């Protein structure tokens, strides 16, 4: 299963020039492009090997569009400030995310396009790629403007067309990396936390993609009480890490097992102290 | 302002010299475009801005052309070392905002830029009014006056009819573009005809005054002139006729 | 190269419908279709635009093909005021690039044609005169003179509003002495019924 996602952030800085605009693009859990309004290149830039092969027409095109994205966001900041009756003095944020999913069979699975103002939902394209979900009266004004200009249709065409088309092209051109699965390297550690209790920490390392399920069990049964799960995190080499811990009573560690599920594994793994 | 404003409306520039063209967009409009247009062609894209940023200047024909919009409002298009080939209608446009909402483009009046190798080739128009023939009058009970503006260059004229001191459009038809008096010269002076048709009755009243007005845009105040004939400055040339019962 | 395609010229009669055709065979679902018009002596101005649905407003209708590979701008009842260049524009990013458009000429309804050539004398006690081919039917095609020293303008339509009367005319003149009206307005232009007095 696969996805392409673009994330766009603009942040106004009242007394200090035009908004900071940062754009990043991903294919699954792999970043492949970026743009930073403050950076020197003023170009869309590569961040994956397989995208560098793309010709200068690609780079010129993506750099024109990403810049137009930021200029449009620059307008939004002014408009939203008006919609909400806010002062010139405060820094505010707009975020746009859009992208598309394909099945394991490479056929179109779903599209999305949503928008937030100061970190909360403002407006979003519904799953039918035809209609809009608008939070408040401001977002309703936006909703009507967008319905009127058939924005959902333009977006539908992109998500079902170009989006999935270039996701596929990227997945081909970079198959050697994007389509490999790195199964998690796995182990358990043990810490005595008190006279009578120990923590068991179950580790998953250098796995890819990021999707993974670590669960604990007690006597072959799912267990949540006293379990701690951290956010899946980047190792920085393109792979991911995660751990899950339980606090058990000392001398009962044999009762517990950790189970690991991951696309790269022939089958789920079990670990015990 | 409320609409897109460009200045100067007309410009004669001596070849080899620089020229600056000004666009004032509709207040608050984020996007600003520059086009130029030749006779019998559509607008040719030149460059485009979103605020102060020149988002696309692929249309600029060469290094002599540059544009700026320093504070995201007024834009100036500068052409250095002008060539005759630069002559054209330069058209500014603005729209409220970029993006899928497709804010419509608003276009200004334009700047007619005429680059001339030699300003001595500039001539104001001469105007003459021809009275309707009695033959028309008796045959159709209508009277067609005909105005001829001749000998002018460049094609910077606006022709209007004034009847008892009031401009009229009903009954009028002016040629869409002029004729060259000398077809073999790309240099050629021009001629333009206009007709005003009124009722035989109206023309037959002697108290009715008809004036053909031709406004010409020529050399500016600071253009140097050293011919013996009057400097061909922007000016109005008119000819007239009074109504005749017989 | 060009992204839309249009006939360079076209003509229709007043008070009747005009279908102005446009081709854009290589089009995407993200390409909008825009029409702008340019009246004589004016700059372009917006008429209509759309994506896949047919559009209607006060000025016109936009008819888009099911396969979106062609479109039509419909003028329900073209007046003389609608003569203009109509531009069909394909756009997906606000580039708004113009082609050469279609130049629409709107022919007046000349009922009671009265093809005639008159001679008008200068008002200023001069000895110059001009020739006025007037009142022909709109199917008449004037042509520019071959004698360089003879001037013949294109035909021009005027509208005497307060009499609901419209008439075609073309004008011709020359400074050489041997010149006379038959010369420019020859039999190779004018029909019969051409009242051609002294």
């Amino acid at each position: 299963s696969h996805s392409m996602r673009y994330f766009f952030t603009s942040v106004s800085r009242p007394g200090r020039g035009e908004p900071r605009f940062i754009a990043v693009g991903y294919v699954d859990d792999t970043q492949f492009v970026r743009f930073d309004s403050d950076a020197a290149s003023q170009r869309m830039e590569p961040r994956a090997p397989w995208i560098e092969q793309e010709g200068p027409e690609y780079w010129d095109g993506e750099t024109r569009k990403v810049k137009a994205h930021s200029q449009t966001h620059r307008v939004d900041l002014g408009t939203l400030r008006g919609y909400y009756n806010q002062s010139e003095a405060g820094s505010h944020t707009v975020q746009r995310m859009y992208g598309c999913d394909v099945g394991s069979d490479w056929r179109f699975l779903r599209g999305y396009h949503q928008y937030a103002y100061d970190g909360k939902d403002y407006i979003a394209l519904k799953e039918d790629l035809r209609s809009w979900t608008a939070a408040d009266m401001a977002a309703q004004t936006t909703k009507h403007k967008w319905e009127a200009a058939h924005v959902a249709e333009q977006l539908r065409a992109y998500l079902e067309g170009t989006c999935v088309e270039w996701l596929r092209r990227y997945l081909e051109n970079g198959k050697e990396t994007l389509q490999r699965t790195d199964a998690p390297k796995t182990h358990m550690t043990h810490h005595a936390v008190s006279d009578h209790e120990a923590t068991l920490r179950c580790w998953a390392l250098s796995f890819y993609p990021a999707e993974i399920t670590l669960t604990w069990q007690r006597d072959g049964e799912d267990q949540t009480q006293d379990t701690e799960l951290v956010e899946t995190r980047p190792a920085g080499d393109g792979t991911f890490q995660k751990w899950a811990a339980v606090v058990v009573p000392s001398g009962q560690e044999q009762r517990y097992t950790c189970h690991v599920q991951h696309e790269g594994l022939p089958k789920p793994l079990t670990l015990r102290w | 302002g409320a609409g897109v404003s460009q200045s100067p409306r007309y410009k004669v520039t001596k070849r080899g010299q620089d020229v600056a063209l000004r666009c004032d967009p509709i207040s608050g409009h984020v996007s600003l475009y520059w086009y130029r247009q030749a006779l019998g062609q559509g607008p040719e894209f030149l460059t485009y801005f979103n605020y102060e940023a020149q988002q696309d200047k692929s249309g600029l024909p060469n290094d002599r052309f540059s544009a700026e919009r320093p504070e995201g409002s007024i834009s100036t298009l500068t052409i250095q070392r002008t060539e005759q080939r630069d002559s054209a209608m330069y058209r500014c446009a603005s729209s409220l905002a970029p993006g899928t909402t497709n804010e419509k483009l608003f276009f200004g009046s334009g700047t007619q830029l005429s680059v001339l190798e030699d300003l001595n080739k500039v001539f104001p128009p001469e105007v003459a009014v021809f009275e309707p023939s009695e033959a028309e009058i008796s045959h159709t009970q209508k009277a067609t006056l005909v105005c001829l503006a001749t000998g002018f260059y460049p094609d910077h004229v606006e022709l209007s009819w004034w009847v008892n001191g009031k401009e009229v459009h009903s009954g009028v038809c002016t040629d869409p573009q002029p004729l060259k008096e000398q077809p073999a010269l790309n240099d050629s002076r021009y001629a333009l005809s206009s007709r005003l048709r009124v009722s035989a009755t109206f023309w037959q009243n002697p108290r009715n005054h008809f004036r053909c007005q031709v406004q010409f845009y020529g050399l500016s105040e600071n253009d140097e002139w050293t011919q013996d004939r009057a400097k061909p400055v922007t000016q109005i040339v008119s000819a007239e006729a009074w109504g005749r019962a017989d | 190269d060009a992204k839309t395609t249009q006939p360079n010229s076209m003509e229709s009669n007043e008070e009747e419908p005009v279908h102005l055709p446009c081709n854009h065979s290589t089009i995407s679902g993200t390409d909008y279709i825009h029409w702008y018009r340019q009246l004589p002596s004016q700059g372009p101005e917006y008429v209509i635009h759309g994506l896949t649905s047919n559009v209607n407003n006060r000025m016109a209708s936009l008819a888009i093909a099911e396969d979106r590979k062609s479109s039509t701008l419909i003028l329900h009842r073209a007046t003389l005021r609608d003569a203009a260049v109509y531009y069909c524009i394909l756009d997906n990013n606000n580039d708004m690039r113009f082609g050469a458009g279609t130049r629409l000429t709107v022919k007046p309804n000349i009922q009671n044609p009265d093809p005639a050539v008159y001679q008008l004398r200068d008002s200023k006690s001069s000895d110059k005169s001009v020739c006025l081919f007037t009142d022909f039917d709109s199917q008449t095609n004037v042509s520019q003179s071959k004698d360089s020293d003879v001037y013949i303008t294109d035909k021009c339509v005027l509208d005497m509003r307060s009499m609901d009367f419209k008439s075609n005319s073309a004008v011709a003149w020359s400074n050489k002495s041997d010149f006379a009206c038959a010369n420019a307005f020859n039999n190779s232009i004018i029909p019969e019924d051409t009242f051609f007095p002294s």
Binding site: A68, H69, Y98, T142, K145, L155 | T100, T101 | -
Partner: peptide, 9 residues
């Protein structure tokens, strides 16, 4: 491949 343009709010 970026959408050709985005809508202002």
């Amino acid at each position: 491949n970026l959408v050709p343009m985005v809508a202002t709010v």
